[PDB]
Amino acid sequence: DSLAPEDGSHRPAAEPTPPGAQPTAPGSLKAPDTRNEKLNSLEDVRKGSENYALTTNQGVRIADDQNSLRAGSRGPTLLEDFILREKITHFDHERIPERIVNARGSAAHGYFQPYKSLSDITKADFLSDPNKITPVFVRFSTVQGGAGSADTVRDIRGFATKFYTEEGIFDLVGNNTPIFFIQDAHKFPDFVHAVKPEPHWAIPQGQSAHDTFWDYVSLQPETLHNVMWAMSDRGIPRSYRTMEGFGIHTFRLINAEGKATFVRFHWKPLAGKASLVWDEAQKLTGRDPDFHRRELWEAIEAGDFPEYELGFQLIPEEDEFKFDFDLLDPTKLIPEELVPVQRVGKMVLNRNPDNFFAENEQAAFHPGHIVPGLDFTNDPLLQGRLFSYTDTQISRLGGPNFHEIPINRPTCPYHNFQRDGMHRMGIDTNPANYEPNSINDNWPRETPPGPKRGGFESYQERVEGNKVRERSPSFGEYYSHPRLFWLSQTPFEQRHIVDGFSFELSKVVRPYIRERVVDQLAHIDLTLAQAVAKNLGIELTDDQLNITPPPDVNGLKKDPSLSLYAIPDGDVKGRVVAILLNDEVRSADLLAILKALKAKGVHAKLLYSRMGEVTADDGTVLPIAATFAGAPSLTVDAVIVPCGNIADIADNGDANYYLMEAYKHLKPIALAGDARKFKATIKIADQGEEGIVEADSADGSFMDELLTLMAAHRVWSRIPKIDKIPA
Amino acid sequence: DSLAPEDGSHRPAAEPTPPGAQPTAPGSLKAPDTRNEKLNSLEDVRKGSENYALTTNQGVRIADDQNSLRAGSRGPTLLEDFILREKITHFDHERIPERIVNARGSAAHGYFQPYKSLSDITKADFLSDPNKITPVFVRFSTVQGGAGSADTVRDIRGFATKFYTEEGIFDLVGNNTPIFFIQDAHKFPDFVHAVKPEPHWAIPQGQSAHDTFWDYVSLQPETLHNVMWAMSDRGIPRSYRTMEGFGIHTFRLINAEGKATFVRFHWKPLAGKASLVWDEAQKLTGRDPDFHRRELWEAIEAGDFPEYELGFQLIPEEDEFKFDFDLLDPTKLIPEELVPVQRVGKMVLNRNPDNFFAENEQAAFHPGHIVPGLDFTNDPLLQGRLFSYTDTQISRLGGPNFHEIPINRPTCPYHNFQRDGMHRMGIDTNPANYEPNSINDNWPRETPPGPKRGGFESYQERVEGNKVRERSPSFGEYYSHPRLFWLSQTPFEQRHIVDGFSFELSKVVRPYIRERVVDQLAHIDLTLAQAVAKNLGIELTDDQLNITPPPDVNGLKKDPSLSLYAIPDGDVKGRVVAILLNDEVRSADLLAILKALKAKGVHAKLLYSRMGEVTADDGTVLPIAATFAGAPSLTVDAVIVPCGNIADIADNGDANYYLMEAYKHLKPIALAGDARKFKATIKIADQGEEGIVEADSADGSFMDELLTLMAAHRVWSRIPKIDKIPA
Numbered sequence A, B: 001d002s003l004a005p006e007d008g009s010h011r012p013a014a015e016p017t018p019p020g021a022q023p024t025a026p027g028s029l030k031a032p033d034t035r036n037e038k039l040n041s042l043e044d045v046r047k048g049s050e051n052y053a054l055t056t057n058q059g060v061r062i063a064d065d066q067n068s069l070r071a072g073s074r075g076p077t078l079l080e081d082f083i084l085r086e087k088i089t090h091f092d093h094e095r096i097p098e099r100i101v102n103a104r105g106s107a108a109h110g111y112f113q114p115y116k117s118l119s120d121i122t123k124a125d126f127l128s129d130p131n132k133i134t135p136v137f138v139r140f141s142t143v144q145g146g147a148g149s150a151d152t153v154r155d156i157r158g159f160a161t162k163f164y165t166e167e168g169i170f171d172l173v174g175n176n177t178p179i180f181f182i183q184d185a186h187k188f189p190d191f192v193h194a195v196k197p198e199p200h201w202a203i204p205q206g207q208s209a210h211d212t213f214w215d216y217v218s219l220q221p222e223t224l225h226n227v228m229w230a231m232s233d234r235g236i237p238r239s240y241r242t243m244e245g246f247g248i249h250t251f252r253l254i255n256a257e258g259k260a261t262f263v264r265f266h267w268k269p270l271a272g273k274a275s276l277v278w279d280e281a282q283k284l285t286g287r288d289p290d291f292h293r294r295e296l297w298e299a300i301e302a303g304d305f306p307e308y309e310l311g312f313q314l315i316p317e318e319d320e321f322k323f324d325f326d327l328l329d330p331t332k333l334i335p336e337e338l339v340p341v342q343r344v345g346k347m348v349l350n351r352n353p354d355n356f357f358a359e360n361e362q363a364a365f366h367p368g369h370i371v372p373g374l375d376f377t378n379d380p381l382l383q384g385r386l387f388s389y390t391d392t393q394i395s396r397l398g399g400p401n402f403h404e405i406p407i408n409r410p411t412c413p414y415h416n417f418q419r420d421g422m423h424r425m426g427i428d429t430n431p432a433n434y435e436p437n438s439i440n441d442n443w444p445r446e447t448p449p450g451p452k453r454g455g456f457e458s459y460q461e462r463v464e465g466n467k468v469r470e471r472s473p474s475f476g477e478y479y480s481h482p483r484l485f486w487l488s489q490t491p492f493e494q495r496h497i498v499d500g501f502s503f504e505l506s507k508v509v510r511p512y513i514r515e516r517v518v519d520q521l522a523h524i525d526l527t528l529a530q531a532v533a534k535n536l537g538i539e540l541t542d543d544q545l546n547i548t549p550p551p552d553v554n555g556l557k558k559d560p561s562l563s564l565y566a567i568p569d570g571d572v573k574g575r576v577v578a579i580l581l582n583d584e585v586r587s588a589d590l591l592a593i594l595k596a597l598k599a600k601g602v603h604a605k606l607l608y609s610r611m612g613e614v615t616a617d618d619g620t621v622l623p624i625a626a627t628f629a630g631a632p633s634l635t636v637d638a639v640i641v642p643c644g645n646i647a648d649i650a651d652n653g654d655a656n657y658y659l660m661e662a663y664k665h666l667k668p669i670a671l672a673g674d675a676r677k678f679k680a681t682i683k684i685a686d687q688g689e690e691g692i693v694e695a696d697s698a699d700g701s702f703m704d705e706l707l708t709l710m711a712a713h714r715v716w717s718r719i720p721k722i723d724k725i726p727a
């Protein structure tokens, strides 16, 4: 109809722009030049739209897409309207089953590149040449909730990477915590059923705060390690860009000589580690249930590409038994103070998808998708995972040919004797559909193992024992890793952990379940146990108070790599600041604030009590991003209030509340000139306090103080001060 | 094995208990004695568990459900472990596609009963006899969000009722608003795509506040009437028990003599009409995203059974064209001032399901599922709905035998010649699978239509016109029902409407879309348009200021039944009060509180700053239901603060914040004795204020005041005092 506005304002600029600045859009419309080989091979299935006639699926042009065919304009719909019928039919079949676990996820395209050849330890082609680029597709996710639940729940996050190598798809399907809850895959369905919504009423969504989770945990102490991690701030990351990633299981690297090495896979966030605080995370599920999805997407459109360093913990075959814990036990971490992570390569995520359904929702990852140069181990959880995935994927995607869906295909077409199945797209021409054959001179052919481009051979690990359904006795230790984790956290991290356990156990209706969790916490650490106990109105028995603590892990009293914050790794590029305007902002302060933010790659959003524009003292017209209520403090990393007619907003409940919520959630607050009248709102002494930047104006110094606070992410020293303000 | 606790406290009592008193459970365990013919017929597929051996699906007992089968305790898992493969396999295939629309739903069982015989106007058997009951199954839902999305979003609600009649299943598939957004089923996929998450990034969930939605609305003014309903407090109901239900389309009633009467179906909630306020509802999507689901379930476990009265708007065939709107247009409502709702029967929901998946998720409703005595009309939206539902259910549920899933089966066996299909449960013995046949003497047989127990015969409506894809010109009016809706709302409802539009349009990135919506509102009502425009920083043009308002609807200047609150209809039974404990509560006050609350059937939740128990002044041990933060004021209808050691909670940040949030949300607050000191927290004058009950102690008058206030639902007169309080 030519409904677009005459001005071109409906379509974003195909260049990197700041979050909130332009309508977001499909990846290849937004960043047409961001390319790689996999992204280039997808061009054959991308479809355009502009300037085409509207058609049926069979190519017939549609004249009237507003009406059904009927006998009279007020008469009955006629069965012969095939156009109406195809439209409703497709719509009626849009949905597919969501993943059993990790149904909520957000994904992006990018590339990986190794720093140096790793040929001495692995013949994996993607690790052999630093001038070589392997396209990747990453999907991050939550675990428990549906595809439509909230992003910022407390939970473990999945972190799956598909590597389209030259010798096959390698999928590195890991999580954001280095261990899992259970030891043997046989218990996956019991554990997952316990954390998922309870069967009689399907409640609660996206939460482990319910009886069944804690019943299970209280009966299966192998779970306490990963439960500590989830109860901590690790359970509620600030963003997918600011969390670690782990393969979890011990795998094998295999070189050209046949030497096998043990490896654990790590991803280090180049943006540093950072998480929200519980009240903030919970509230954020209400105000913006898509916060992680949006943030990841907008980060990529702004050019703040999520960057991660692939790292390896390497353990020679001869040191297999040299630890306190079993290397093949997935509830056990390998302390970096014992086995350091070696830097291997870098992954950059620089393009969003075009169609979430087509690329994200249909993407299929599998930990069994390994390439020559890698191999498994006998880890019993990994071993049972090797059976799931493909199984579930055919159910979910419609057939065994789901490897032909565009996102899932290798960069080089495969050749084998597999035929038919639902929705077969390739048309095979080989005369032979079996091997060995003589009618196609045996093609395609087997390829011996070799140093490069050889066929897949499993490592000839020795196998010895009886056929038994038995847990290895070396896996029977459950409290020493949870304790190592506990001792490595800072004091404010310990309290957050205490509050995580306290909050969750309080949603457990059956009191005895709470008491049993407390009993288990008393086997990890007495100080942890007493503080949780106290929050539940429980007193430990004398016996509980004398439980002897678990042994150290290989003599360690702590390991600082396990804390999010003990060792500062801050980075503010990509963070965002809220700027509370008034109806006559001193433009001098605004100019100084925005330019300083911009120099460090920090984003800003101009907020007011209404939408539209406000005009600064010199006549500068300032466009408003969102209102105070519309873009709450939960969504920003810090707040700045410029001088101006402060009386315009000083009595605005939403304005004041904005600073109270941000102060409560430990965020840096900066007040310029008369904005300092808000100090009374958050009870700040005349003197001032650490975490509150204030001055007569927003000069250079003022912005450097604010940015330094931003580099340390939150104002932990404010904790005792927040207790009292009602917010 | 002894896992249950000694006391037997792991399992709920099988009697009506207030919310949070005991753990919730499967309805047949919770209320074994609640029966009806449908509930009893589910007995063939209901399964027990206590005292049974754990077995495979093939009946083989399992000895070890903790371990996979491997070669040596630390070796690899063996392919021959069929116990493990079955377990993992069934889990891998758990999920089914969720509903295309209305995926988020909460359901229950109950019964319906007519007040009197309706045999002069219909031959439908379920309306023929006041002493004959019909089992029902009801599913309430949101529209936009997925199965794991939140309950208290802003959206339309679906209200589907499955009547298991003696002459077949009748499904009355309605919503909580009398009209739908569009006129022709052809546009359904267009309208649902625009409101659903945006295709590139799949954001946002369960919210219409995004560009594609408002883009569609601004170009399709036929959507404005249901947009008005959605933006008012109808869009955020307090409970599924506190909303209206409507079939929306005009349908037909056909009596035994063949006379047709046009009819619109209504449900009246006997718990009255009530809704949340936006800030509360959005915040509630974070604190408790399963709030409506939970409240329904717990109301039924408490004995507070959701009850609705079925009502009919009856219009004789000769009055088809007597309104100034088309009777067959589903964007138009029939004002109760023109055609009254006649009482027809009562529906009571008295039993929760046993398994949400098996009975809620697999339930299938179809507006095409009518019985003799009822028939359709040419409503173009209704007509195209008959091309859908069956279709989607076969892909969703797995095949054409979805009528054989327990929850969907009619009470009496069905008989026909249809055979085979995936998962066929019935085993047919008819020698003939076709008709006419002579080998089974033509059984089963066709039955002629008649007054009772006859075959279905469509009403013989005259059809006249050419085959056209054309909108009836009589449907071409879009502004007068919107305006009639607007003028019938109270002043505080109109402010709420203004704010919904202001809020939503502010999340619309492209400003011209905001401007187009405003221009459409200026065709409905200038005052409304002006208020929205001013919140968006927009100026109405001179042209926009001179648009003549649309015509009245058949001389009406308003219709009070369109308002939630203009006519008082308050019912407190089943509501819930928060009681903020301290560590030395005046048992005298608590006693008075609970006895008065009990007499009106209002529940209570005892809150404290920690979990466990507190002891009152007389030694009564009071167990704590939840903390102040853990069960926020959002979740209750009113707040009571009893005397006791007030100093224990006087400086409690969460306790003070509880009252500020409640106050802001217009909830009734009661303060006894020293609890009156919290009056400063919410800045209330020394004298007093309408909406705050205060006294030396909690007494007879104290509770009456409080209960009278709760019967009015919210304190609307407090609206002007809340926007300064930063809450």
Ligand code: HEM
Residues within 6 Å of the ligand: A098, A099, A100, A101, A102, A105, A139, A140, A141, A157, A158, A159, A160, A173, A174, A175, A180, A184, A185, A188, A247, A248, A249, A330, A363, A364, A365, A381, A382, A384, A385, A386, A387, A388, A389, A392, A393, A396, B088, B092
């Ligand atoms: C170390 C332990 C595990 C980790 C790190 C892990 C990680 C993941 C991740 C990240 C995903 C989502 C991938 C995506 O975004 O599509 C996922 C999905 C899945 N996981 Fe695993 N998981 C683990 C254990 C298991 C086990 C023991 C089983 C069962 C034997 C299992 C079965 C599944 C299934 C069936 C899916 C759905 C896949 C699909 O539909 O494509 N997981 N897992």
Ligand code: HEM
Residues within 6 Å of the ligand: A088, A092, B098, B099, B100, B101, B102, B105, B139, B140, B141, B157, B158, B159, B160, B173, B174, B175, B180, B184, B185, B188, B247, B248, B249, B330, B363, B364, B365, B381, B384, B385, B388, B389, B392, B393, B396
């Ligand atoms: C008056 C307008 C409409 C109303 C009141 C309405 C109501 C409903 C309700 C309440 C449900 C959920 C049923 C449940 O709880 O299982 C539903 C589902 C559905 N609706 Fe309608 N709807 C309307 C228009 C339409 C139209 C025009 C179409 C397509 C032509 C349509 C297609 C569907 C489909 C495909 C489902 C999913 C059913 C299933 O998977 O079992 N609806 N509708």
